[PDB]
Amino acid sequence: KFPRVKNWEVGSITYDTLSAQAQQDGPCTPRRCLGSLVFPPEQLLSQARDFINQYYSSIKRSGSQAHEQRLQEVEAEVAATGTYQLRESELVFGAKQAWRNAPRCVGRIQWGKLQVFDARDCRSAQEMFTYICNHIKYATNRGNLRSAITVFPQRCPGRGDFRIWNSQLVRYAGYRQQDGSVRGDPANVEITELCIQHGWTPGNGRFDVLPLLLQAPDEPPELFLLPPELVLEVPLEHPTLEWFAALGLRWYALPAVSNMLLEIGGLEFPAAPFSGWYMSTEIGTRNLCDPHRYNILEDVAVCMDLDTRTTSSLWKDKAAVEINVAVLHSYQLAKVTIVDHHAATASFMKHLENEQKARGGCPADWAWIVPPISGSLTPVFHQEMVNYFLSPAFRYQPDPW
Amino acid sequence: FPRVKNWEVGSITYDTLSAQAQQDGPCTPRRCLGSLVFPRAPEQLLSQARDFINQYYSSIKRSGSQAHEQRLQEVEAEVAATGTYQLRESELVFGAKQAWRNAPRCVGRIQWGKLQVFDARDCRSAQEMFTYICNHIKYATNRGNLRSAITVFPQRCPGRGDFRIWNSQLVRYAGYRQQDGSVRGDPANVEITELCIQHGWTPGNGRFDVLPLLLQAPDEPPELFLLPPELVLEVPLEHPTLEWFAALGLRWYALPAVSNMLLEIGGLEFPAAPFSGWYMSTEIGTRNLCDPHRYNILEDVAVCMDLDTRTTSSLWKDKAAVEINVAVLHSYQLAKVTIVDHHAATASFMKHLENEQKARGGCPADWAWIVPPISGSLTPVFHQEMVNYFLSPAFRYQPDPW
Ligand code: HEM
Ligand code: HEM
Ligand SMILES: Cc1cc(N)nc(CCc2cc(CCN)cc(F)c2F)c1
Ligand SMILES: Cc1cc(N)nc(CCc2cc(CCN)cc(F)c2F)c1
Ligand SMILES: C[C@H](O)[C@H](O)[C@H]1CNc2nc(N)[nH]c(=O)c2N1
Ligand SMILES: C[C@H](O)[C@H](O)[C@H]1CNc2nc(N)[nH]c(=O)c2N1
Ligand SMILES: [Cl-]
Ligand SMILES: [Cl-]
Ligand SMILES: [Gd]
Ligand SMILES: [Gd]
Ligand SMILES: [Zn+2]
């Protein structure tokens, strides 16, 4: 009843004992597997107990002293208020642990080096904006990116909620026309039309950095223009394909997810923007080449004079590899931290070994860990993985409308 | 009723067919084991049989008809009398085709209805088994115009051993454990190679030595059978523009013919039912040739291409891999051997999914096996969510009979 997990490259076997702790249930049954699907009062005490018990085992402080103490304060805090506040070190530990537990994240070898800004004493979107702006400039750090999460006030009943309406802190606009097709990023068409609805002058171009829509409790969202010198971007060029620069492609330096809901010890923070640095395939494969994204694949292939007339020339494969090469090269020349999918997945294999010794396994979503190009050329492809929900966690949440 | 989105188009369907998944796999609400390579009594034989006959009679527009209950009645009487029952031939052809239709890890299922079923259930020995097999290889190879085929050897039955083909495929390359602990040839085939040797095969010492067949008649030791070289159509590998690539000496064979899986139809088990189609180029170019635990040529090709193999950010692995795949497609087209690239194959599979959504209300699909091992998000199946489940009839894995 402890899943046997095999690696088919080496032949090594481990058992995932950690899967036994799975709190929230995922989408699969003995009947059918939905692993490939993207989006599958005082029990607050039970989650808060366990998280505090985690915290203290993590500091070699199980069964002693402040463990028992802090158990009481949360007991009394919830008893009196129907909720509780996290000790600063726990909000930090919960942030680091939710990252550690993100099955779909391949960069979790870095989970232990995360900078937590505590924005829990926030009030008004004007405040978030400078909280977000500090994060952005801290995380960006002139291109030497540093993992950062800003945690805005936890949710409480009767009162509203802090939300960033954008999926990320940096998003490119997407506009329809007298023919429907999108100039710019089609993934952001909707938040782009929202930003315009809330009175933003639309740009003309394919890489217009959207403005932020920030939402203090029970107040309508407020447009915020991001300081352009705060938004570090990388114009894309290719080392040997001199014409690639002429395609005018750019991406931003900072992958900063601003629509997910941090959950620690039963507390839900609907606004907790976390950021790290990009793996190159995210930009060069998914963002630029997905058919419903910038969809530049055939354009690059035209410019490389590839045989787009037959699938078997592998023109798609060839052009995609060069786009990724241009992403990597451009980011490295701009001295912006980026990691290629080979380095990233090799570090994740190291992570799995760490976690096997540390916690006896690791929740990992195979479909999202394996890169979107050259999958079987990365060692994670040949690694069986167990996917399950551990707490604390980053969770998906409804669009705040 | 699982809702299933296509992220490239925005499509949404609900897989009503998953509710019919009888046998059960490895996942729970607690944890997903989707990525596991090997997930997994007269009355129960009766209900599998009953369901399959229901299926067969559905397919012939005769559900609930006279002949339907007669067959139901017949099967129960025969399970009562013999403990088992015999498929009619039209049922066997249907069950072989459904088994393919139901195989969740087959991206080539658009072709599931075009399948040549050879009825070898009268097979009597290993020697007759070999002859049926040679004719399978001959028919399917078809001088490089490959045709999908399956040969069904006698079903498992009380009193007698199983027919087994010990080889995992009809065409395998020898893998010799070396002097210095390495492998010469295909490392995936060390075990079967060792077995062949033990059973009297005089080994070679090349990298592409075609294996003899170990063929097991019931209650018999396996028997060694060499394949006539002229029956085994191979493809020397060259690259359309890298001319040094032909000097690698690389080959692959034309016919992918899986021979160690069990065919299950209405509760009956055929532990020997080899089946064959044609390759997708990634199976050869990416997996067979570049897997570190296989031929592992990626670095030697990238070195020959003068790629910068000292840094991973140069994407030398991706680049060498793509030209190995190019080489495979070119070489098979040049040799006039049927081959489908992963873009064509995944696009035809998208049509399979649509046909299957109209026909049955969904399609069992193992996303991690359907999505090709290079250029995954470049193919449409990447952005298609899928519901993986087990339908019968089915091809199942089975333990190696040694
Ligand atoms: C520092 C380097 C990091 C790298 C290279 C990295 C890489 C990735 C990649 C490639 C994904 C794929 C999921 C997708 O494409 O949507 C992912 C998912 C994810 N990562 Fe990481 N990440 C990093 C840092 C972080 C940090 C700091 C956090 C949180 C504290 C985090 C939390 C997550 C979460 C929640 C997901 C799932 C998001 C989703 O499924 O949409 N990551 N990561
Ligand atoms: C005609 C062209 C065909 C194509 C292009 C094709 C393609 C594929 C591919 C690429 C895989 C994954 C293989 C792997 O990585 O292990 C696969 C799996 C499979 N195919 Fe098909 N196939 C074809 C014909 C057939 C036929 C005729 C049958 C049976 C009647 C069949 C049954 C299966 C089964 C059972 C699997 C899963 C077994 C396994 O791969 O572990 N296929 N197919
Ligand atoms: C911190 C971080 C670093 C990184 N390198 N990458 C990510 C994932 C970014 C992301 C992308 C998409 C696009 C569709 N997958 C959806 C998300 F929800 C999401 F968080 C997050
Ligand atoms: C009929 C058929 C056609 C085709 N084009 N391909 C196959 C798959 C061959 C195969 C390969 C491997 C290697 C590891 N995946 C394991 C299997 F179980 C298997 F059946 C079968
Ligand atoms: C349907 C399929 O599961 C979906 O497209 C997933 C697959 N794997 C992924 N992996 C990453 N990293 N990002 C994604 O958006 C997806 N999409
Ligand atoms: C461990 C992992 O499941 C394993 O490497 C799988 C992944 N997906 C695959 N998909 C296909 N088509 N063929 C394979 O051999 C594999 N191998
Ligand atoms: Cl992104
Ligand atoms: Cl193969
Ligand atoms: Gd030109
Ligand atoms: Gd040349
Ligand atoms: Zn599952």
DSSP reduced 3-state for B135 = helix
Residues of B in contact with A383 (CB under 8 A): 35
| C-alpha torsion angle, residues A290, A291, A293, A298 (rounded to 10) | 90
Give the resolution to one decimal, in Å: 2.0
Q: How many CB atoms are located within 10 Å of the residue B44 CB?
A: 9
Report which residue type is found at A262: L
- Whose C-alpha lies nearest to ligand 2, atom 18? B106
Q: Which of B101, B106, B112, B196 is catalytic?
A: B106
CA of A282 relative to ligand 7 center, distance in Å: 6
| Residue among B17, B55, B194, B104 nearest B396 (CA) | B104
Separation between Cα atoms, residue A372 and residue B372, nearest integer Å: 10
- Nearest ligand 5 atom to the CA of A37 is 3
Buried b vs exposed e over B173-200: b needs ≥16 C-beta within 10 Å?
bbbbeeeeeebbbbbbbeebbbbbeeee
Estimate the share of chain A in helix, then strand, then coil, as percent rounded to the nearest 5: 40, 15, 45
Separation between Cα atoms, residue A77 and residue A75, nearest integer Å: 6
Q: Best mutation site among B18, B23, B35, B190 for testing chain A: the one with the most A CBs within 10 Å?
A: B35
- What residues 304-323 of chain B have any CB closer than 8 A to a CB of chain A? 312-315, 317-319, 321-322
- Whose C-alpha lies nearest to ligand 1, atom 19? A105
Q: Is B169 annotated as a binding residue?
A: yes
Burial of A169 (0-12, 13-18, 19+ CB in 10 A): buried
Does A9 sit within 8 Å of B293, measured CB to CB? yes
Q: Which of A70, A99, A100, A105 is catalytic?
A: A105
CA of B218 relative to ligand 9 center, distance in Å: 66
Q: Are B133 and B151 in contact (CB under 8 A)?
A: yes
What sections of B223-290 are H helices per DSSP?
Answer: 281-282, 289-290
Nearest-by-Cβ selection for A384 from B37, B291, B322 = B37
The answer to whether the Cα torsion of B197, B200, B206, B210 is positive or negative is negative
Secondary structure E strands in B243-372? 251-253, 257-258, 262-265, 268-270, 275-276
Q: Are B2 and A29 in contact (CB under 8 A)?
A: no
3-state SS track over A238-293:
CCCCHHHHHHCCEEECCCEECCCEEEECCEEECCCCEECCEEHHHHHHHHHHCCCC
Give the tokens for residue B167. 């080889």
Cα distances (angstroms) measured from residue A117 to each of A122, A150, A259, B38, B142: 12, 5, 17, 44, 68
Q: Are B56 and A48 in contact (CB under 8 A)?
A: no
Q: Which residue has the tokens 């009594």?
A: B41
Does B322 sit within 8 Å of A36, measured CB to CB? no
Q: Which of A108, A155, A163, A171 is catalytic?
A: A108
Give the tokens for residue A210. 């959207």
Give the tokens for residue A361. 């396994």
Q: Are strands B164-165 and B213-216 parallel, antiparallel or unpaired?
A: antiparallel
DSSP state of A211: P
Question: Who contacts B315 (Cβ-Cβ below 8 Å, separation ≥6)?
Answer: A321, A324, A325, A328, A340, A342, A374
For ligand 3, is residue A282 a contact (CB within 6 Å)? yes
Residues of A in contact with B370 (CB under 8 A): none
DSSP reduced 3-state for A22 = coil
Please identify every residue whose CB atom is under 5 Å from ligand 11, which is an ion.
A 28, 33, 35; B 27, 32, 34
Q: How many CB atoms are located within 10 Å of the residue B41 CB?
A: 7
Give the tokens for residue A110. 């870095």
Ligand index nearest the alpha carbon of residue B242: 10
Separation between Cα atoms, residue A210 and residue B357, nearest integer Å: 39
Q: Are B266 and B399 in contact (CB under 8 A)?
A: no
Does A343 sit within 8 Å of B329, measured CB to CB? no
DSSP reduced 3-state for A234 = strand
Report how far apart the first and last C-alpha atoms of chain A are (Å, whole number): 42
Could you list the residues of A known to form a binding site for L-arginine, using ranges. 168, 277-278, 282, 287
The string of DSSP letters for A72-115 reads HHHHHHHHHHSS-PPPHHHHHHHHHHHHHH-TT-S-GGGTT--E
Q: Which residue has the tokens 């002293």?
A: A65
Q: After which residues does chain A become discontinuous at a C–N distance over 2.5 Å? A: 40
Overall residue count recorded for chain A in this entry: 401
Separation between Cα atoms, residue A335 and residue A332, nearest integer Å: 5
Cα distances (angstroms) measured from residue A94 to each of A12, A195, B50: 32, 32, 54
Separation between Cα atoms, residue B86 and residue B77, nearest integer Å: 12
The string of DSSP letters for A148-198 reads EEEEPPPP-TTS---EE-SSBSS-B-EE--TT---EE-GGGHHHHHHHHHT
| Residue among A275, A72, A47 nearest A154 (CA) | A47
Does A386 sit within 8 Å of B317, measured CB to CB? no
Does B291 sit within 8 Å of A376, measured CB to CB? yes
Q: What is the largest CA-CA distance in chain B?
A: 72
| Residue among A126, A213, A120, A200 nearest A164 (CA) | A213
Q: Are B216 and B222 in contact (CB under 8 A)?
A: yes
DSSP reduced 3-state for B167 = coil
CA of A365 relative to ligand 11 center, distance in Å: 10
B194 is annotated as an active-site residue: no
Q: Are B321 and B297 in contact (CB under 8 A)?
A: no
A127 is annotated as an active-site residue: no
Does A386 sit within 8 Å of B32, measured CB to CB? yes
Q: Best mutation site among A32, A285, A365 for testing chain B: the one with the most B CBs within 10 Å?
A: A32
Q: Phi-psi bin for B293: left (phi > 0), alpha (psi -120 to 50), beta?
A: alpha
Q: Does B298 touch chain A (CB under 8 A)?
A: yes
The answer to whether the Cα torsion of A324, A330, A332, A334 is positive or negative is negative
B69 is annotated as an active-site residue: no
Give the distance from residue A291's alpha carbon to the nearest chain B alpha carbon, in angstroms: 6
- What residues 252-281 of chain B have any CB closer than 8 A to a CB of chain A? 281
Domains of chain A with bracketed CATH: 16-120+147-157+261-275+345-369 (3.90.340.10), 121-146+161-232+396-400 (3.90.440.10), 233-255+278-343 (3.90.1230.10)
For ligand 5, is residue B385 a contact (CB within 6 Å)? yes
| Residue among B312, B291, B205, B302 nearest B248 (CA) | B302
CA of B284 relative to ligand 4 center, distance in Å: 10
Q: Best mutation site among A29, A34, A328 for testing chain B: the one with the most B CBs within 10 Å?
A: A34
Give the distance from residue B38's alpha carbon to the nearest chain A alpha carbon, in angstroms: 10
For ligand 2, residues with CB inside 6 Å are B 100, 103, 105-108, 111, 115, 148, 150, 275, 277-278, 280, 283, 287, 340, 345, 369, 395
Q: Does A50 touch chain B (CB under 8 A)?
A: no
Estimate the share of chain B in helix, then strand, then coil, as percent rounded to the nearest 5: 40, 15, 45
The secondary element (H helix, E strand) that includes residue A344 is helix A341-359
CA of B368 relative to ligand 6 center, distance in Å: 6
Q: Best mutation site among B7, B32, B307, B389 for testing chain A: the one with the most A CBs within 10 Å?
A: B32
Separation between Cα atoms, residue B168 and residue B256, nearest integer Å: 10
Residues of A in contact with B383 (CB under 8 A): 290-292
Q: Does B8 touch chain A (CB under 8 A)?
A: yes
| Residue among B246, B242, B4, B253 nearest B141 (CA) | B253
Between A and B, how many residue pairs show a Cβ–Cβ distance under 8 A?
A: 219
DSSP reduced 3-state for A57 = helix
Q: Are strands A393-395 and A212-215 parallel, antiparallel or unpaired?
A: unpaired
| C-alpha torsion angle, residues A195, A201, A202, A207 (rounded to 10) | -90
Q: Is B32 annotated as a binding residue?
A: yes
Does B32 sit within 8 Å of A30, measured CB to CB? no
For ligand 5, is residue A368 a contact (CB within 6 Å)? yes
Nearest-by-Cβ selection for B367 from A26, A36, A289 = A36
Q: Indicate the angle between helix axes B89-101 and B42-59, nearest 10 degrees.
A: 90
Give the distance from residue B123's alpha carbon to the nearest chain A alpha carbon, in angstroms: 36
Cα distances (angstroms) measured from residue A54 to each of A97, A265, A358, B377: 10, 10, 13, 38
CA-only gyration radius of chain A, Å: 22
Does A340 sit within 8 Å of B312, measured CB to CB? yes
Question: Who contacts B189 (Cβ-Cβ below 8 Å, separation ≥6)?
Answer: B168, B172, B173, B174, B175, B211
Q: Does A40 touch chain B (CB under 8 A)?
A: no
Q: How was this structure determined?
A: X-ray
Does A312 sit within 8 Å of B329, measured CB to CB? yes
Give the tokens for residue B209. 């030595």
Give the distance from residue B23's alpha carbon to the nearest chain A alpha carbon, in angstroms: 7
